[PDB]
C-alpha cells in the first residue's frame, strides 16, 4: 500500500536520468543537416544518431545497467534503441497536430514526408497509431521513464548472455511500476497491462523498421547518408 525507499530511489534516479538526457527546447536540432521538403534522410539520420546518444546516456544511469558486461550493454542497446526512441518521442508527439513538434515549423515532422526519408506507411501507420495509443494513457513521467527502463532491460533480446541477471533487474522495475500505479496513479488499476501491451507493440514496430532499414543500408547511395553511430548500432555485428 506504500512504496518502499529503494523503490523510490529507483524512481528518483530514473527521473533524473531522463531529465539530463532529454531537452524540451530541442535547441540542438539546429546542428543537424537541415530538413528538405530521399531529401529527409540526412536530417533523420542526424536526429536518430543524436537520440541514440541520449539513450546510451540514459541507460548508463539506470541502477545496475553499468554493472553488466560491456557486451550485454551493447546487445541491449543494439536491439532496444529504436524502441526507446519511439518511446521518448511521445514527449514531442501532439494529438492536435498528429505530428511531432520539436521547434519551429522546420522541426515539425508530419508523416507525409515518410517516403522522403526512405520509409513507407507500413512503418508510419502503426507508429502513429502506437503514438496516439501511448498518448491516451496520459502517463506520469514516472511511468514513462519506467517503461523505457523496462524496455531496455528485456532479457529476450538477441545477443543477451546473462538473461537471468537482467531479468531480475527488469523484474525489480516492474514491481516498482506495478506499485507506483497502485499507490500514486488515480484510476490506475488496469494501466500496467496496457503499458505491457505497448511493449509488445514495440517489438512489432522494431521489426518493421529493421526490415526497412535493411533496404536502405544495402543501397550505398542511401547508406552514405547515415552517420557512423546509426550504422554501428542498427548494423548487424
Amino acid at each position: 500500500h506504500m512504496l518502499s525507499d529503494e523503490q523510490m530511489q529507483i524512481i528518483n534516479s530514473l527521473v533524473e536520468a531522463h531529465h539530463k538526457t532529454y531537452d524540451d527546447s530541442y535547441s540542438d536540432f539546429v546542428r543537424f543537416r537541415p530538413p528538405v521538403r530521399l531529401s529527409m534522410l540526412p536530417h533523420l539520420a542526424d536526429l536518430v544518431s543524436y537520440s541514440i546518444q541520449k539513450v546510451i546516456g540514459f541507460a548508463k544511469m539506470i541502477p545496475g545497467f553499468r554493472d553488466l558486461t560491456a557486451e550485454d550493454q551493447i546487445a541491449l542497446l543494439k536491439s532496444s534503441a529504436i524502441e526507446i526512441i519511439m518511446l521518448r518521442s511521445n514527449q514531442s508527439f501532439s494529438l492536435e497536430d498528429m505530428s511531432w513538434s520539436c521547434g519551429g515549423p522546420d522541426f515539425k515532422y508530419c508523416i507525409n514526408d515518410v517516403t522522403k526519408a526512405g520509409h513507407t506507411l507500413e512503418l508510419l501507420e502503426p507508429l502513429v497509431k502506437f503514438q496516439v495509443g501511448l498518448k491516451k494513457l496520459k502517463l506520469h513521467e514516472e511511468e514513462h521513464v519506467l517503461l523505457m527502463a523496462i524496455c531496455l532491460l528485456s532479457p529476450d533480446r538477441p545477443g543477451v548472455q546473462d538473461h537471468v541477471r537482467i531479468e531480475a533487474l527488469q523484474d525489480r522495475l516492474c514491481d516498482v511500476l506495478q506499485a507506483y500505479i497502485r499507490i500514486q496513479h488515480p484510476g490506475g488499476r488496469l494501466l500496467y497491462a496496457k503499458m505491457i501491451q505497448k511493449l509488445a507493440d514495440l517489438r512489432s514496430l522494431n521489426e518493421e523498421h529493421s526490415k526497412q532499414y535493411r533496404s536502405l543500408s544495402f543501397q550505398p547511395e542511401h547508406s552514405m547518408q547515415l552517420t557512423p553511430l546509426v550504422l554501428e548500432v542498427f548494423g548487424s555485428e
Binding site: 546518444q53 546510451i56 548508463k60 560491456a70 550493454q73 551493447i74 542497446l77 543494439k78 557512423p228 553511430l229 554501428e232 548500432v233 555485428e237
Partner: peptide, 10 residues
C-alpha cells in the same frame, strides 16, 4: 567491433 559504442559506454 563496436568501437563507438564501447567509447560511449565509457
Amino acid at each position: 567491433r563496436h568501437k563507438i559504442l564501447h567509447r560511449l559506454l565509457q
